[PDB]
Amino acid sequence: HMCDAFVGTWKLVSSENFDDYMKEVGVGFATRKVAGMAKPNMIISVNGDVITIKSESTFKNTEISFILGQEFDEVTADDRKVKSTITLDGGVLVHVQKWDGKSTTIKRKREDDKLVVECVMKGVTSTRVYERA
């Protein structure tokens, strides 16, 4: 029942500083513009030890399935091929992505009725707020 509070169907309702975050990641102009429009839905489910996060948008659909603490390969919406490890730290899902000698951390937490996603690349944070769909 670990991530039970994350389970469900979520829709992006607000974003802050996402363009700057993408710039810091290395996303190019066209992908930044198109990705920045999107209002993804995220579907989170758990089956035994396997957590699945599916994201659907006009731009791209993504999907990751993983076991906490166990590194896996991930294709991001901006098409990076990364090595990802996701843990739980005090009720927060902590997701580290490594590629090309770079690293970014995405933290997901429940706050009131929202699922708040903080994406950090060096000194730059973007906050992406989801509500139940």
Ligand X SMILES: Clc1ccc(Oc2ccccc2-c2nn[nH]n2)c(Cl)c1
Numbered residues of the known binding site for a fatty acid? 128-130
Query: Is residue 78 involved in binding ligand X (CB under 6 A)?
Result: yes
By CB under 6 A, residue 117 contacts ligand X: yes
Question: Is 93 an interacting residue with respect to ligand X (CB under 6 A)?
Answer: no
d(CA 70, CA 57): 27
CB atoms within 10 A of CB 91: 11
Query: In the 8-state DSSP scheme, what is residue 6?
Result: G
Nearer to ligand X by Cβ, of 48 and 102: the residue is: 102
Q: In angstroms, give the least distance from the CB of 42 to ligand X.
A: 7
Cβ 86 vs Cβ 51: under 8 Å: yes
The CB-of-111 to ligand X minimum distance in angstroms stands at 15
Phi and psi at residue 4, to the nearest 5°: -55, -35
Pull the structure tokens for residue 55: 């994201």
Point out which residues bind ligand X (CB under 6 A): 35, 38, 40, 55, 57, 59-62, 76-78, 117, 119, 128
